[PDB]
């Protein structure tokens, strides 16, 4: 059946605080895998009706090591939003995230998020990932992720 | 098979810091849906033994503009919890948040929580959703929301 | 089908600032679910090949009355380890938490972790949850937990 789990690819990260599309996604190292699903530039293409379950985990890490945050309280997003080869139109389907103060002299800090649901998914429909603060990720594989699994075929 | 995905109604929501519970979810509008189950005043009802796998998703923010926080130090929560009729009695089957300070004058203030796991309910049980500060919610339906899904026949 | 849904038991939990296995799960009082997979010293062994979602709860908690805080910036982190029989060498699945500050003021403290993911499983591997700052755990069954269940067969 159906089915991702793809993992962060650090190599490719722009720099900034800017909400931007995480594009760079693994999908046969360690964990990360994919089934009947493509991937098409950080973007997870449904090739198959259903209702799948669509999940992400996203980490966000800030060492005193590389500098000093860009801001004291900051945003730390993660944004699940689904697109269409067919049309153009865009869509969020879960969000999650939280403001967090990391301005002081606290050697490290650290944040994650998880979001999860159900949908009704057509061949077509792609899903992708929008976070903020993309310099502040955290680049392990158990670490920062997002996926999907086909429950049951569609109505 | 039996599933639903319920995006919160925040035309009706009270107010205060007490836990409450909501009762205003949707079923046809947007990612909103529902299958087999059915929803009566925010209390998901199951019409089908097996195993379930039950999630929500619950956003917060605040903005100095309306003042300052109840208590400093305020509790972001949220309850998922079940009703059974073969014995009246609230149970808790899940339950996560966290203590933030948004008091003081702040910027934008913003924090999530998702919680999730695998249940065996009979039919005729119900589901509900408890938070506290319903006040402080976030009405976009990628936001606040909850629901569930049959994985497998049950025992 | 194979599937787990273990609940935290405070009887034997330890204290310290350091990552450290959680051995003590119930698979039998209310929530507490387990079938087929083993449950041998907080070790979820698997014994059907096959793709699980694998999930986790954690609720930490501090009240003023308790004492003291470690520090200052305290590490809440939450980890889904693999272990082969192949290799009892441990690999990370997923990871989450946040550094958050309770020291200080505020009476009561709390925050809580999710992780959820789907995984390729052969029988015969262990699944583990370590944690940090074990002495802060929230007992309560539906505060703490983490469980695992089949998806479909394996290729």
């Known amino acids: 059946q159906p089915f991702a789990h793809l993992t962060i690819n650090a190599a490719s990260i722009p720099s900034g605080s800017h909400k931007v599309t995480l594009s760079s996604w693994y999908h046969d190292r360690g964990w990360a895998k994919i089934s009947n699903m493509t991937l ?34 900051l945003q730390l997003m993660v944004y699940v939003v689904k697109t269409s080869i067919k049309i153009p139109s865009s869509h969020n389907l879960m969000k999650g995230g939280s403001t967090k103060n990391w301005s002081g002299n ?23 990932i929008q976070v903020s603060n993309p310099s502040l990720l955290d680049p392990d594989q158990d670490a920062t ?3 999907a699994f086909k429950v049951q075929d569609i109505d």
């Open 145 to 147: 992720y997002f996926g």
């Open 106 to 128: 606290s050697e490290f800090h650290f944040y994650s998020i998880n979001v999860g649901g159900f949908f009704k998914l057509r061949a077509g429909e792609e899903i992708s």
């Open 40 to 73: 098409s530039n950080g973007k997870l293409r449904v090739n198959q009706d259903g209702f799948y379950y669509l999940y992400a985990n996203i980490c966000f890490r800030h060492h005193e090591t590389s500098g000093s945050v860009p801001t004291d309280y």
